[PDB]
């Protein structure tokens, strides 16, 4: 488990799903233009980039 460690596994995981949580609940019990953006970001059919 050299290139695949799970102690680099763990914090990695911890990054993405606090990283990602943070500004997903921030919305929540935090009203802000992103929303706006992400709200209709979201609602398209294939959101990205061209």
């Known amino acids: 488990m050299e290139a695949l460690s799970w ?3 763990a914090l990695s995981l911890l ?3 606090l990283g990602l ?3 997903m609940l ?3 019990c935090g009203w ?3 929303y706006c953006f992400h ?3 979201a609602w398209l059919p ?3 980039r061209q």
Do not use: Q, S, Y
């Open 7 to 9: 102690d680099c596994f």
């Open 21 to 23: 949580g943070v500004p």
């Open 26 to 28: 921030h919305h929540l």
């Open 32 to 34: 802000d233009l992103w």
């Open 46 to 48: 294939w959101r990205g």
């Open 39 to 41: 709200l209709c970001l």
């Open 15 to 17: 990054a993405v799903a």
